[PDB]
Structure formats: structure tokens, C-alpha cells
Write a protein that binds this DNA or RNA. Structure first.
Ligand SMILES: Nc1ccn([C@H]2C[C@H](O)[C@@H](COP(=O)(O)NP(=O)(O)OP(=O)(O)O)O2)c(=O)n1
Ligand SMILES: [Mg+2]
Ligand SMILES: [Mg+2]
Length: 430
DNA sequence: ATGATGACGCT
DNA sequence: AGCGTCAT
């Protein structure tokens, strides 16, 4: 009736940088612009592991996780940029500093939630209201939306991409109800005008291009952001959800990419997100637990309430290095020396963090992985973090892990360690 | 033999 | 506290 809650209460955007680490290298090195290129770490192993790929290289099939020597078999002209190395390990400082540039611009428009090194959610609900007051009642012109796609449009009675975009935008604007300031579709439209400006400001002020999703919640905004990458934004309205979800594989919705999504698919015998609507909430809660069941029931209807959190800073700061296979650490002073390397990089980052952000970490988390063991982390142990001192931190990390040494011999380390990981957590104002 | 990270749920 | 999942 008049109480059916539609999940149209908010305007939320997700902004995500196109091939971010590649754009950072291309801004620095003009020779790599508008060319197939990739960013790699560790040149020694098969040319390096690829961690970011430009769209011109994607057209040859180059992907992340590929070795650079194999990528060159698909794309012989592929240009590479390699990540800085310090203290024997990959150092991502350049990309974190580029991330700060973007996050600071977006913060001028609205409350943002930093979601990764290259993306942030934006609650635009308030700015949409303000903007709607300011705009008397003047219609919204297609010229305000020069890079916006309206998902699901055009429909009903042009063979090139820009042609299709415009007709869908014209259809949307033609039907839009501009003298009725509570319509969620109007609010999304105004939200998309603001995200055009935010994206123009990012590119003008950093030279970085990006894509965006505009919708009513984080999940839809994230989904919408990927529909028309690169350098384009997509509005997913509440009404577009049934058709969009009818052929949307379950694994594409955020948090359904892993084991949970696989069991939804296998337990229910379904493929697409919209098929979930067939099930009562209690049924979904019986199969997947009370929170997953409630979430799924609403999400397959386009409704989700996870808020955009006001957080632009990480809660943790971490350094880790893998020692796969034959390089697994197997002597005590090898473990000590790498812990000192990690502690030294971490202390540099913490000190910068304390000066920029006026806070200190108070807990140190050591994590390790031993050979054979199957999981991301074999074992985590915590101690106090009272001094930004690299030697103290690596001393304390060794202290709390050294009893994992199954080794009989004095100087040996058994079983060999395939991963070390130092993390600073439990930040407090300073 | 991608790796280097980060957020958060569960018990 | 320590372990597990999901993510870029
Ligand atoms: N597994 C991953 C995924 C991304 N990244 C880094 C490199 C990416 O450039 C950056 C952002 O990831 P994305 O997942 O946002 N990829 P980008 O490379 O940003 O591509 P598009 O977002 O244009 O598809 O994070 C990473 O190091 N390891
Ligand atoms: Mg991106
Ligand atoms: Mg991203």
C-alpha cells in the first residue's frame, strides 16, 4: 500500500578510476599514453606479475595476474612500467599518493567513504536537495549529462555507441518530472549532474579519468559503475532493476563473488539475481542465515541500506611479502632481516600518517604463512605498538612468532615461512 | 610463481 | 583474541 518501502531514500555514487595504476604511470611518462601498457612488479619472474592493464592492452586479452612474458605473447607491442622497489619489496607509495589527490577532490563535494585505493562511495542525498532548491524549476538539459548512460534505455519504437547513449538520455529526460521534487528518478538525475562535475574536476585537477555509478545504494552504484567503463557514468534507476537483474549472474553483485554466492546458486538452483525474488525472506534466512537472508531478499529487489560511512582514512596500515616455494624463509636471521625490512617500511608510513592525520596506532599484528598450509594467513599474533621504531617492532614481531619454530636445530626455521605480514591497527587520536 | 594490501564477520 | 571471507 502506501507503506511499501522502495529503497529510494538515498542518492549514492561509486567513483572508480580507470586502470588506475596505469594512469598514474602514464601521467608521469607521456610516452605510455594511449598505448597498450601494463604495470608489473618484480621483473625477474617471467617479466613481472601484471597488476594493472590499460584498455588498449585489454583489447588484446592482456589481464591482471598474467606474467608479463605471457602478456607479450598476446600483445607484442605492450609497454610496461614497473613498481618502485625498496628494501627488497614492492613499494606502492606513488599510487597511494595519487589516491590522496583524487580523494581530496571528491571530499569537496560530499561525504565520501574510501572503499579502495582507487574508489570511493558518495552520499549525494543532501547535495541533491540543495541543488534542487537552487534550480528554481528549470528543466535538466542533456548538455549537463555529456557522459551519462541511462541503464535500460533506449527502448521501444542508431548503430553507434554515442548515438545509443543520447537517445536513451533523451528518452529519460523527456519523461522526467522536473516540477515534482520528491521523485527518486529526478533525484538520481540531479545526482548524476553533480557526478559529471565531480568527474570533470578529478580529470581537470589530476589528469586521471574515471567512471561512476549513480543509484540508490552502494551495491547498485558499484554495479552501475562497471556497465560502461571506461570514462563514462551510468545511472541505474529503481525501475531498471527487474530487467537488469533478470540476466545478471549472481556472482557480479558485491559480496556474492565468493563461497556465499556459489551456495546461493547451488542450494537454490538459480543463475540470476532476479530469480531470488521467488523466495520468501524466511526461506532465504533458513538457507543462508538471518542477515544474509534478509539482505538477499531485499537486494534482489534493488533495496540495500548499508550506509556510506564517513571514512577517508584506512583503519589499518600494513606491509607484507610472500616467499613462495623455494624462497620460503628457512633460517632464523632470514626471518629477522625481512621482519626488519617490513618494520622499516611500516615505520615510514606510520610517521607520515601521524603527521598528516593526527592519530597513532596502538596495536601491532604479526601474521605468517608456512609452507603447505592452504590459507591466506597461517597464524596471527598481536602485541602493543608503543613506539614508531623499526627495530623495536621487528623485535616484538619476532618475539611473538618465534615459538612457531618447530625446528630442532638452533639456527634453522621450520616449517619454512612463505609469508610475513606486519599490520598497525587500533588507531587513537594524537 | 601473480602479489600487496584493506574491511569486516564469526566465535 | 584469532581465524575466515571478500574485496581491489
Ligand atoms: N587484485 C587487484 C586489483 C586492483 N589492484 C590495483 C591496481 C588497479 O589499478 C587499482 C584499482 O583496481 P580496479 O580493481 O579499480 N582496476 P583499474 O586497474 O582500477 O581498472 P578499471 O577499474 O578501469 O577496470 O588497484 C591490485 O593491485 N590488485
Ligand atoms: Mg578502477
Ligand atoms: Mg576499483
Amino acid at each position: 500500500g502506501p507503506h511499501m518501502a522502495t529503497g529510494q531514500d538515498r542518492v549514492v555514487a561509486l567513483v572508480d578510476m580507470d586502470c588506475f595504476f596505469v594512469q598514474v604511470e602514464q601521467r608521469q611518462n607521456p610516452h605510455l599514453r594511449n598505448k597498450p601498457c601494463a604495470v608489473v612488479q618484480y621483473k625477474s619472474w617471467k617479466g613481472g606479475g601484471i597488476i594493472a592493464v590499460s584498455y588498449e592492452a585489454r583489447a588484446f586479452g592482456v589481464t591482471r595476474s598474467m606474467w608479463a612474458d605471457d602478456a607479450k605473447k598476446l600483445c607484442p607491442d605492450l609497454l610496461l612500467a614497473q613498481v618502485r622497489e625498496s628494501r627488497g619489496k614492492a613499494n606502492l607509495t606513488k599510487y597511494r599518493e595519487a589516491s590522496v589527490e583524487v580523494m581530496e577532490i571528491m571530499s569537496r563535494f560530499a561525504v565520501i567513504e574510501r572503499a579502495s585505493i582507487d574508489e570511493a562511495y558518495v552520499d549525494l542525498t543532501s547535495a541533491v536537495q540543495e541543488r534542487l532548491q537552487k534550480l528554481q524549476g528549470q528543466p535538466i538539459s542533456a548538455d549537463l549529462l555529456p557522459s551519462t548512460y541511462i541503464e535500460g534505455l533506449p527502448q521501444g519504437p542508431t548503430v553507434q555507441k554515442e548515438g545509443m547513449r543520447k537517445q536513451g538520455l533523451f528518452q529519460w529526460l523527456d519523461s522526467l518530472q522536473i516540477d515534482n521534487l520528491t521523485s527518486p528518478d529526478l533525484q538520481l538525475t540531479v545526482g548524476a549532474v553533480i557526478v559529471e562535475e565531480m568527474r570533470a574536476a578529478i580529470e581537470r585537477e589530476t589528469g586521471f579519468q574515471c567512471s561512476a555509478g549513480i543509484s540508490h545504494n552502494k551495491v547498485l552504484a558499484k554495479l552501475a559503475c562497471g556497465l560502461n567503463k571506461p570514462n563514462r557514468q551510468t545511472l541505474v534507476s529503481h525501475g531498471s532493476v527487474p530487467q537488469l537483474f533478470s540476466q545478471m549472474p549472481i556472482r557480479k553483485i558485491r559480496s556474492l563473488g565468493g563461497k556465499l554466492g556459489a551456495s546461493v546458486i547451488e542450494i537454490l538452483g538459480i543463475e540470476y539475481m532476479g530469480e531470488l525474488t521467488q523466495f520468501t525472506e524466511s526461506q532465504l534466512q533458513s538457507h543462508f542465515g538471518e542477515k544474509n537472508g534478509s539482505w538477499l531478499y531485499a537486494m534482489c529487489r534493488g533495496i540495500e541500506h548499508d550506509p556510506v560511512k564517513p571514512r577517508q582514512l584506512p583503519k589499518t596500515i600494513g606491509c607484507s611479502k610472500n616467499f613462495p616455494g623455494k624462497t620460503a624463509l628457512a633460517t632464523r636471521e632470514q626471518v629477522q632481516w625481512w621482519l626488519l625490512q617490513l618494520a622499516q617500511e611500516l615505520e615510514e608510513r606510520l610517521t607520515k600518517d601521524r603527521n598528516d592525520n593526527d592519530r597513532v596506532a596502538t596495536q601491532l599484528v604479526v601474521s605468517i604463512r608456512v609452507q603447505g598450509d592452504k590459507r591466506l594467513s597461517s597464524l596471527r599474533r598481536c602485541c602493543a605498538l608503543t613506539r614508531y621504531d623499526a627495530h623495536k617492532m621487528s623485535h616484538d614481531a619476532f618475539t611473538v612468532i618465534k615459538n612457531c619454530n618447530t625446528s630442532g636445530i638452533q639456527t634453522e626455521w621450520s616449517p619454512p615461512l612463505t609469508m610475513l605480514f606486519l599490520c598497525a591497527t587500533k588507531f587513537s587520536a594524537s
